[PDB]
CSV table of C-alpha atoms in Angstrom, one decimal:
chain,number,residue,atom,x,y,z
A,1,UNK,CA,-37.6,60.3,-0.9
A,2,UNK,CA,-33.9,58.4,-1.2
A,3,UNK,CA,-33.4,54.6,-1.4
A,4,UNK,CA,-30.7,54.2,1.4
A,5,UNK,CA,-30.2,56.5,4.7
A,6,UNK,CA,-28.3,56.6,8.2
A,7,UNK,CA,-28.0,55.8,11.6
A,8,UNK,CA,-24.7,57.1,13.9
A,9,UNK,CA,-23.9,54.1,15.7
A,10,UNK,CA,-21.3,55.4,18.3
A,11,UNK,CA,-19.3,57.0,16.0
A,12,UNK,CA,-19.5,55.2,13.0
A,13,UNK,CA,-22.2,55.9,10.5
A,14,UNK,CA,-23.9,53.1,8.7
A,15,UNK,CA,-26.0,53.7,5.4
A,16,UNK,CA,-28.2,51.3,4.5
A,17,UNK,CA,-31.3,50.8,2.7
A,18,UNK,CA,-34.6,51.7,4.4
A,19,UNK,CA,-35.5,47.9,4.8
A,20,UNK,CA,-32.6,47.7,7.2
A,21,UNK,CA,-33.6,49.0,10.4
A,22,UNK,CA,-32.9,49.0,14.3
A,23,UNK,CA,-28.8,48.5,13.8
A,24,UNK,CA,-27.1,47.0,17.2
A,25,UNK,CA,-23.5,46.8,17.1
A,26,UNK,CA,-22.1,42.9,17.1
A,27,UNK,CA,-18.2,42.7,16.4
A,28,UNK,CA,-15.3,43.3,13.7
A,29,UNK,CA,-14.6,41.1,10.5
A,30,UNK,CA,-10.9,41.2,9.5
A,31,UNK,CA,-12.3,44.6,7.9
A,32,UNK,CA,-15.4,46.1,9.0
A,33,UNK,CA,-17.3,47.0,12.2
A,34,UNK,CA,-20.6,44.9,11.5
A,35,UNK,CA,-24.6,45.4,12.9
A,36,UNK,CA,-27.3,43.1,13.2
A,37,UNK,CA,-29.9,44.4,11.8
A,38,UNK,CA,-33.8,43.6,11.2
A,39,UNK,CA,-34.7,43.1,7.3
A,40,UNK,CA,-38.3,44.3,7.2
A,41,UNK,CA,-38.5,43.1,4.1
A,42,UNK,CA,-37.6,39.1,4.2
A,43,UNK,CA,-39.5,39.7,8.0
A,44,UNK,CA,-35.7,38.3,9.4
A,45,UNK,CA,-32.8,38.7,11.2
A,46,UNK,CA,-29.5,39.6,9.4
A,47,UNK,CA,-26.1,40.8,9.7
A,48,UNK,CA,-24.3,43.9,8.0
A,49,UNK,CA,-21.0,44.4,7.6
A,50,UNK,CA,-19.9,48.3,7.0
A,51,UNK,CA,-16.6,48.1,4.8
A,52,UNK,CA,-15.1,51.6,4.9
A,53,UNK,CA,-13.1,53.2,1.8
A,54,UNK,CA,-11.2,49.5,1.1
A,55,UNK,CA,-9.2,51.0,-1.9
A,56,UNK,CA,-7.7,53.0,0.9
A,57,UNK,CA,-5.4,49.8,1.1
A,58,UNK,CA,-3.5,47.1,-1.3
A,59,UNK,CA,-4.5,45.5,2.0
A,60,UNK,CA,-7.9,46.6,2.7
A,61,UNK,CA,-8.9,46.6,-1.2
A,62,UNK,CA,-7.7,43.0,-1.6
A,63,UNK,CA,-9.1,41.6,1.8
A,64,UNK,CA,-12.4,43.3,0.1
A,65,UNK,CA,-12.3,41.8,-3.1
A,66,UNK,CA,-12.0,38.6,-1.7
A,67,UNK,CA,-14.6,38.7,0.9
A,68,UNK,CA,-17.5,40.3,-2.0
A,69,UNK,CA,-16.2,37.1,-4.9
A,70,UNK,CA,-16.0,35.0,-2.1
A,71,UNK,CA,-18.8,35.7,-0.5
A,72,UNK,CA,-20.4,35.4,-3.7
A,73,UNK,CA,-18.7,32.4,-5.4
A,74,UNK,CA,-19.3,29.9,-2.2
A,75,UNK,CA,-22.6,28.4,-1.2
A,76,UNK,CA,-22.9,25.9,1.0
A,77,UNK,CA,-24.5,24.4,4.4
A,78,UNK,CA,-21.8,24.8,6.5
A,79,UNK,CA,-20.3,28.5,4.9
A,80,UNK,CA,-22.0,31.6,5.8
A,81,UNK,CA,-24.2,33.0,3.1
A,82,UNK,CA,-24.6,35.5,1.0
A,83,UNK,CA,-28.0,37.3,1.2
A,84,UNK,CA,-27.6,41.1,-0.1
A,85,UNK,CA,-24.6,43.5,-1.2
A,86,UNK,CA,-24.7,47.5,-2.1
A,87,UNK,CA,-22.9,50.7,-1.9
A,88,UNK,CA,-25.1,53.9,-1.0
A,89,UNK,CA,-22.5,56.0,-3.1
A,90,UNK,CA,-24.4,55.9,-6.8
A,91,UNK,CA,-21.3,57.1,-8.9
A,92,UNK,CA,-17.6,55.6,-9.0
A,93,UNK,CA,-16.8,59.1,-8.7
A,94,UNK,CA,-18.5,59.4,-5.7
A,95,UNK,CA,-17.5,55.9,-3.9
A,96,UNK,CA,-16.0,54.7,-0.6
A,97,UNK,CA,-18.3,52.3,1.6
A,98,UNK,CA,-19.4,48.5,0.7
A,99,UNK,CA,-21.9,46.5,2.7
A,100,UNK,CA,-22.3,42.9,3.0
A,101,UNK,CA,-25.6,41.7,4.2
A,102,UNK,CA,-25.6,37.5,5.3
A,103,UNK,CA,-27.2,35.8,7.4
A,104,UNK,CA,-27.1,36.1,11.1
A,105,UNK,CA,-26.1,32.9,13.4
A,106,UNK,CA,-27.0,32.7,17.0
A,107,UNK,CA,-24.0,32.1,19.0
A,108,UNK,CA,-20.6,32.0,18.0
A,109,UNK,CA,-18.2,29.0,19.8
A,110,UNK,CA,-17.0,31.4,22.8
A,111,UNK,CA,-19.4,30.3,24.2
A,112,UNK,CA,-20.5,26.7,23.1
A,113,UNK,CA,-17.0,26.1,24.7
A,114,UNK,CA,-17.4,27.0,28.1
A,115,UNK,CA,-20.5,24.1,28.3
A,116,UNK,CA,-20.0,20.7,28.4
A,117,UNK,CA,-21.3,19.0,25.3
A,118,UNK,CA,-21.6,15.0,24.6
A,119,UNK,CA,-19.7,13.6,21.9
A,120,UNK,CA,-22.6,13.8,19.6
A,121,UNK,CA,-22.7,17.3,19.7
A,122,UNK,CA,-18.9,17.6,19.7
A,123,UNK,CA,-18.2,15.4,17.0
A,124,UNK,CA,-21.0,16.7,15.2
A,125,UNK,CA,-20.1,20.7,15.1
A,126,UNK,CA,-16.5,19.1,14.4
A,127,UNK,CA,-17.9,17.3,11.3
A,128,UNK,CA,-20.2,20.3,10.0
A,129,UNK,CA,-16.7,22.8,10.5
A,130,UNK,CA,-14.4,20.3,8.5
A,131,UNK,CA,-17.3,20.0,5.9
A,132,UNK,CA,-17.2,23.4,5.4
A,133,UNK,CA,-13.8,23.8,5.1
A,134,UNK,CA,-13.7,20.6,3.2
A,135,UNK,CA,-15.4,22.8,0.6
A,136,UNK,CA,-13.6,25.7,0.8
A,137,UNK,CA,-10.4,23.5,-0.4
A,138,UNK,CA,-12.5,22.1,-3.0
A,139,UNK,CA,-11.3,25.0,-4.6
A,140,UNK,CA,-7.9,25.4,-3.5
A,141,UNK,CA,-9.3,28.2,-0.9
A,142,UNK,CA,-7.7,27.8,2.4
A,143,UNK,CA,-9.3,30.1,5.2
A,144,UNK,CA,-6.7,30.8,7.2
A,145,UNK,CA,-8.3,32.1,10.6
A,146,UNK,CA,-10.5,29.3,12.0
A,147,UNK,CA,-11.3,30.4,15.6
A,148,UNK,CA,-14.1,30.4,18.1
A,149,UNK,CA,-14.6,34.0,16.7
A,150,UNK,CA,-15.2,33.0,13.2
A,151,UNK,CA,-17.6,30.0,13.8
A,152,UNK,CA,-21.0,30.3,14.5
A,153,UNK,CA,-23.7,28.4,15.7
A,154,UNK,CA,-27.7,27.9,16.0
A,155,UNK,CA,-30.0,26.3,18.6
A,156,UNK,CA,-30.9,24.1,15.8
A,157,UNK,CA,-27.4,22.6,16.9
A,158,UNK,CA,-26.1,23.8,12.9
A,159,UNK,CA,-22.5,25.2,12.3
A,160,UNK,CA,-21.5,27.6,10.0
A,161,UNK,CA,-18.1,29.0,8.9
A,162,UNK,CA,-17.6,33.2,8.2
A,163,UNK,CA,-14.7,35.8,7.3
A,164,UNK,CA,-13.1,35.4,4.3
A,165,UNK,CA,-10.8,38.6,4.1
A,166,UNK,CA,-7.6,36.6,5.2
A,167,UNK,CA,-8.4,33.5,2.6
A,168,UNK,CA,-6.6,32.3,-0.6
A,169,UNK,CA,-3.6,29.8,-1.9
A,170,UNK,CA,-0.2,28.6,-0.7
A,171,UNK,CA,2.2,30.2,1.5
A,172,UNK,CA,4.4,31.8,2.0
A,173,UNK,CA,5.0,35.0,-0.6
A,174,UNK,CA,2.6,40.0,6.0
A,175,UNK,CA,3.8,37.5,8.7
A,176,UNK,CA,1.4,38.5,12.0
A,177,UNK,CA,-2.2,38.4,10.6
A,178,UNK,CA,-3.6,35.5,11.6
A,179,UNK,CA,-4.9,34.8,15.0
A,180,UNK,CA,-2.0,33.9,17.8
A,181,UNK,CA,-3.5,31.3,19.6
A,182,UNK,CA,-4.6,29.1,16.4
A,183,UNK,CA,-1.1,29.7,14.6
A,184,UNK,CA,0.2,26.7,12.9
A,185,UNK,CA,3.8,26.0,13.4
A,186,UNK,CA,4.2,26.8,9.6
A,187,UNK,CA,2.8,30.2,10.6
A,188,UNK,CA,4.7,30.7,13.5
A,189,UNK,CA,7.7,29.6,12.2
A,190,UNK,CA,7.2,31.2,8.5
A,191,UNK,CA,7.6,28.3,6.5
A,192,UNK,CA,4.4,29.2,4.4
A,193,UNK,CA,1.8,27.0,4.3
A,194,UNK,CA,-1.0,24.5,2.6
A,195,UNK,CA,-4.6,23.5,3.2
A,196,UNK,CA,-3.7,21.6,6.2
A,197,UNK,CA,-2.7,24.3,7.9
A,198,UNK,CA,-6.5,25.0,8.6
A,199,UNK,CA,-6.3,21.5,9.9
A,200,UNK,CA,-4.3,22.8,12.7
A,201,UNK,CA,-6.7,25.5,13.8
A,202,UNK,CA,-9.7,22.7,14.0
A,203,UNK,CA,-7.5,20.5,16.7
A,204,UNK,CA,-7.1,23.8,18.5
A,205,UNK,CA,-10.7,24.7,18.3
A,206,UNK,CA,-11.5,20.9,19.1
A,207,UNK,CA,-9.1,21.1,22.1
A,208,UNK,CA,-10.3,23.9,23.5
A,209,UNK,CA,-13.7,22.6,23.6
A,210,UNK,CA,-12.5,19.8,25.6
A,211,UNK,CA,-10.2,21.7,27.8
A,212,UNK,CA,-12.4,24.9,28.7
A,213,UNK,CA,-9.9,27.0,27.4
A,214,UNK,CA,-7.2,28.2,24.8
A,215,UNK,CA,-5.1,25.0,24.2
A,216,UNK,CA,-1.7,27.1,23.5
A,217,UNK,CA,-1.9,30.7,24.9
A,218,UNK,CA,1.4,32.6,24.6
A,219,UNK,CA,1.9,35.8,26.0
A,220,UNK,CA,3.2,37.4,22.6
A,221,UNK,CA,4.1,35.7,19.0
A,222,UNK,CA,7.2,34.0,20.2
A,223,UNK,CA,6.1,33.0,23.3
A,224,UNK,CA,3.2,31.1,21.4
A,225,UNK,CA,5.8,28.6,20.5
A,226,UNK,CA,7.0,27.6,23.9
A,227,UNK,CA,3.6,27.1,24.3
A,228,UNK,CA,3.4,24.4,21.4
A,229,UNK,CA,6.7,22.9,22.2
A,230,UNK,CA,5.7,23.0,26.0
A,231,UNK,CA,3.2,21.0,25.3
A,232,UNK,CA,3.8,19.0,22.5
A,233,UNK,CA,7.1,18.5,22.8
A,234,UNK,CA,10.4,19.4,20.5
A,235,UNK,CA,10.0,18.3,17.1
A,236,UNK,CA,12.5,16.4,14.8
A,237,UNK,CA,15.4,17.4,13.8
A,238,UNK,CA,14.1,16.0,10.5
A,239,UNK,CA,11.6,18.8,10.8
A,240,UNK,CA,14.1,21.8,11.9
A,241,UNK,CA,16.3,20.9,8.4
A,242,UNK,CA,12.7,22.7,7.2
A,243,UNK,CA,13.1,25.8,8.4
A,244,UNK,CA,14.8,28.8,7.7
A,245,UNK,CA,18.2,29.0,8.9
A,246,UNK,CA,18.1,31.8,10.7
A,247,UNK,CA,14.9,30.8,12.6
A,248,UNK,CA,16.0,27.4,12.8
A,249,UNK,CA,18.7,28.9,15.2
A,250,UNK,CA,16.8,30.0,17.8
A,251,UNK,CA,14.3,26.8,17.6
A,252,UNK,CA,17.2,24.6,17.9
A,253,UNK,CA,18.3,26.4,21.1
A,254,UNK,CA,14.8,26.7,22.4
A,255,UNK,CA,15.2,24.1,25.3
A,256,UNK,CA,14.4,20.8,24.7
A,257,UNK,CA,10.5,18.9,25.3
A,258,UNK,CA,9.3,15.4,25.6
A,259,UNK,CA,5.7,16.7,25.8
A,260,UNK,CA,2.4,15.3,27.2
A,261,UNK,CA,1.0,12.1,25.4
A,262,UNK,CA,-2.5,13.1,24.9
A,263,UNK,CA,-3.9,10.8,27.0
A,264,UNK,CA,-2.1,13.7,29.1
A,265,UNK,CA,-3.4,16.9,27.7
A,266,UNK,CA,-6.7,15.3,27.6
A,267,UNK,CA,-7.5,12.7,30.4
A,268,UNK,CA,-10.5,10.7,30.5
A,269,UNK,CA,-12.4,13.1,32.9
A,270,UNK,CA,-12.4,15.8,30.4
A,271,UNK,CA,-14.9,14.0,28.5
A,272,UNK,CA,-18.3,13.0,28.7
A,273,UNK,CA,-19.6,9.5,29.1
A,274,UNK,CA,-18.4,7.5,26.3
A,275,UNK,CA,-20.9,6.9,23.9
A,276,UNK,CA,-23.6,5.2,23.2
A,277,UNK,CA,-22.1,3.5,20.2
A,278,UNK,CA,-18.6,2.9,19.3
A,279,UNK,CA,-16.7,5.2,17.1
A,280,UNK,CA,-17.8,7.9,19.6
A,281,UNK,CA,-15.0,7.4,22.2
A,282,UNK,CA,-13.2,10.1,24.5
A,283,UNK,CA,-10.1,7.8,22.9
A,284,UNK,CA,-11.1,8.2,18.9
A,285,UNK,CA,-11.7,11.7,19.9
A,286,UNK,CA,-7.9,12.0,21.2
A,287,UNK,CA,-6.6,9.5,18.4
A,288,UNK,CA,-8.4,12.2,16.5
A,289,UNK,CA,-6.8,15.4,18.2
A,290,UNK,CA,-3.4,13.7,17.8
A,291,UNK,CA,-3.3,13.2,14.2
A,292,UNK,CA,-4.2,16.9,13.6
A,293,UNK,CA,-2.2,18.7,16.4
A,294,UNK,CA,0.7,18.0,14.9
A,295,UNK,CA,3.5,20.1,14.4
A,296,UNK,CA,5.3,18.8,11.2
A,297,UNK,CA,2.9,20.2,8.5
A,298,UNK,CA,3.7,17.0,6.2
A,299,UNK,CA,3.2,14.8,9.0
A,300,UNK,CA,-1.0,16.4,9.4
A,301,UNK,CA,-4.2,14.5,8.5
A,302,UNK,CA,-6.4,15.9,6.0
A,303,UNK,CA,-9.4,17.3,6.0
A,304,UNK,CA,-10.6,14.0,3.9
A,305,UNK,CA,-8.4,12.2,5.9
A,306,UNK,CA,-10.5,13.5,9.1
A,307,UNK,CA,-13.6,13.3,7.5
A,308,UNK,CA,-12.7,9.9,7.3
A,309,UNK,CA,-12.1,9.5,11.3
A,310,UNK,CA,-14.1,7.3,13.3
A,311,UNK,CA,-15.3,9.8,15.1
A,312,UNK,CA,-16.5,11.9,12.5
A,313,UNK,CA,-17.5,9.9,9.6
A,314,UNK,CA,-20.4,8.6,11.5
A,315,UNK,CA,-22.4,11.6,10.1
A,316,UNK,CA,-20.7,11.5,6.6
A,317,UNK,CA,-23.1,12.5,4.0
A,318,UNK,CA,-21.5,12.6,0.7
A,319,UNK,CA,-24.4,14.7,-0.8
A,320,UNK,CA,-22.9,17.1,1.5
A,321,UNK,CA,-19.1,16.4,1.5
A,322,UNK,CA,-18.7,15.5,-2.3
A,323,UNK,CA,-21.0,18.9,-3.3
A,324,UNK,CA,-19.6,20.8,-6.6
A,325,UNK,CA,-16.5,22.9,-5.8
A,326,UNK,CA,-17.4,26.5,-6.0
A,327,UNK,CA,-16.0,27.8,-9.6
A,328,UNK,CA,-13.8,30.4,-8.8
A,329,UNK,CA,-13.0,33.3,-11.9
A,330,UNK,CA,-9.7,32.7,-13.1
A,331,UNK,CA,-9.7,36.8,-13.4
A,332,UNK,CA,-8.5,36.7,-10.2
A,333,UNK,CA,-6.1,34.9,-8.9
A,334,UNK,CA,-6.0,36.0,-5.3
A,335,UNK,CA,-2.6,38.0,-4.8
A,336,UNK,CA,-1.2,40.4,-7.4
A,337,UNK,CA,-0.3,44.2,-6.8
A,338,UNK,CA,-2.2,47.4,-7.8
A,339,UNK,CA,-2.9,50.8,-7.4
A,340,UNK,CA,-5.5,53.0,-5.7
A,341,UNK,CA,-7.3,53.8,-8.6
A,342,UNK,CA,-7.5,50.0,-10.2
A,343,UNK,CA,-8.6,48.7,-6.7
A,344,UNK,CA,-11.1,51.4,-6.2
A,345,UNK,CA,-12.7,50.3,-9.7
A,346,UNK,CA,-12.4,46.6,-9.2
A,347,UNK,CA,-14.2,46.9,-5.8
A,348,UNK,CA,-17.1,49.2,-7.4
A,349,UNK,CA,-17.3,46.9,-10.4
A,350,UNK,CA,-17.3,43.5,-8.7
A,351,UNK,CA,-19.9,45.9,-6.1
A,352,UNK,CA,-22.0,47.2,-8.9
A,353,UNK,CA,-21.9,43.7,-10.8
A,354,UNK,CA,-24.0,42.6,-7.3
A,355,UNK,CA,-26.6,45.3,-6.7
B,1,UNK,CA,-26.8,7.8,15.7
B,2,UNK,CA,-29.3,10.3,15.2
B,3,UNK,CA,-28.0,13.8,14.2
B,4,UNK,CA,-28.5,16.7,16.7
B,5,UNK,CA,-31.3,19.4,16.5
B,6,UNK,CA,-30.5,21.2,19.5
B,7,UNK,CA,-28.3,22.9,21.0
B,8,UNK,CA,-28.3,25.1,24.2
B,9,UNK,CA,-27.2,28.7,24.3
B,10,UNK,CA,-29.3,28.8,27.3
């Protein structure tokens, strides 16, 4: 009799349209509790992502508008795609709850990390990530959460990038939103930030691969910089002159590191046997790492720069490197206030522009 | 160096 219907899973209720059936619970976007879910329809697996009352939210309604352009605008090997959107609510009146439907990965890197993998496969997933985000910048985007969390894989040893509720342009102009562990300096330190900045979540990620686990933990968000600085080492005075001067205090007095070279934090055997061919070496890997891990922002590779590296470039494919930037609507330019009622419109256009 | 088509989530 309807088109849509429900299922209580736990205590959240998902709608969904009757080709969508058998919902487990999987984990949480930036917004959004989100189910697997069979498509009877397509005869495959997919993933849902229940996004409740965003307009409830400046926050929540812009996180949501991103994700549904985004979501929309990007298509690409290595970016997580798009496959179905809706809201059960048939009225603007009426409205409260969007649902993304994309495509479901196996793994994500929790995960892949805990296994030892061969530099193939390393500097492989490495490659297909940068790739991805490569094309993400292509279009000024810069994603802003890379982590284990938000990168998934498949048996068919691909890689693809997800979450785009935290993405958009230059920093800075709310401080703690991004991930702890995978903070740049810029982040930490609230200097705003540029693409690169996504560069320093990869050599984390990267790192943490090699090392089995998180490469700067840090018990809270100020801790996290010991953690850095532990390791790393104090940065230049050059460097401090950056930062705000009431910050820059405390940094300044923060006690003094040389740091691990990285021949240090990452010792021969971490790796696995070096490779067949050249390029391939625990050592470009590390000559690698240490040209992204790198606290001065204006000091940091690229991601062209790393696509470039010896020890990723050996899969460069400019068919899928060089691929058309995703055209973004100049409508929107991804951070300017509103109320309530313009959100909740916006949403339900942009929504009702997709069904 | 032949790209990878598998990977274990054994």
């Amino acid at each position: 009799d309807n088109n849509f219907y429900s299922v209580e899973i736990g205590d959240s209720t998902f709608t969904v349209l009757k080709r969508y059936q058998n919902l487990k619970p999987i984990g949480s976007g930036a917004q959004g509790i989100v189910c697997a879910a069979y498509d009877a329809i397509l005869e495959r697996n997919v993933a849902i992502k229940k996004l409740s009352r965003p307009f409830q939210n400046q926050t929540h309604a812009k996180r949501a508008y991103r994700e549904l352009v985004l979501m929309k605008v990007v298509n690409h090997k290595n970016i997580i795609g798009l496959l179905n959107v809706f809201t059960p609510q048939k009225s603007l009146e009426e409205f409260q709850d969007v649902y993304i439907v994309m495509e479901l990965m196996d793994a994500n890197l929790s995960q892949v990390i805990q296994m030892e993998l061969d530099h193939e496969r390393m500097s492989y997933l490495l490659y297909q990530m940068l790739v991805g985000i490569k094309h993400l910048h292509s279009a000024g985007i810069i994603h802003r959460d890379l982590k284990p969390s938000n990168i998934v894989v498949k048996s068919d040893a691909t890689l693809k990038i997800l979450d785009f509720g935290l993405a958009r342009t230059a920093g800075t102009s709310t401080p703690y939103v991004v991930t702890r562990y995978y903070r740049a300096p810029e982040v930490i330190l609230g200097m705003g930030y540029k693409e690169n900045v996504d560069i320093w979540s990869v050599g984390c990620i990267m790192g943490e691969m090699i090392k089995g686990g998180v490469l700067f933990p840090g018990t809270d968000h100020i801790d996290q910089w010991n953690k850095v600085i532990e390791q790393l080492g104090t940065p230049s005075p050059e460097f401090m002159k950056k930062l705000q001067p009431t910050v820059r205090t405390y940094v300044e007095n923060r006690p003094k590191y040389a740091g691990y070279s990285f021949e240090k934090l990452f010792p021969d055997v971490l790796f696995p046997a070096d490779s067949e061919h050249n390029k391939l070496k625990a050592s470009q890997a590390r000559d690698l790492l240490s040209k992204m891990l790198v606290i001065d922002a204006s000091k940091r590779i690229s991601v062209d720069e790393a696509l470039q590296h010896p020890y990723i470039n050996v899969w460069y494919d400019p068919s899928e490197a060089e691929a058309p930037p995703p055209k973004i609507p100049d409508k929107q330019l991804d951070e300017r206030e509103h109320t309530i009622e313009e959100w909740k419109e916006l949403i339900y256009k942009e929504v009702m522009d997709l069904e | 160096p032949k790209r990878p088509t598998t990977l274990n989530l054994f």
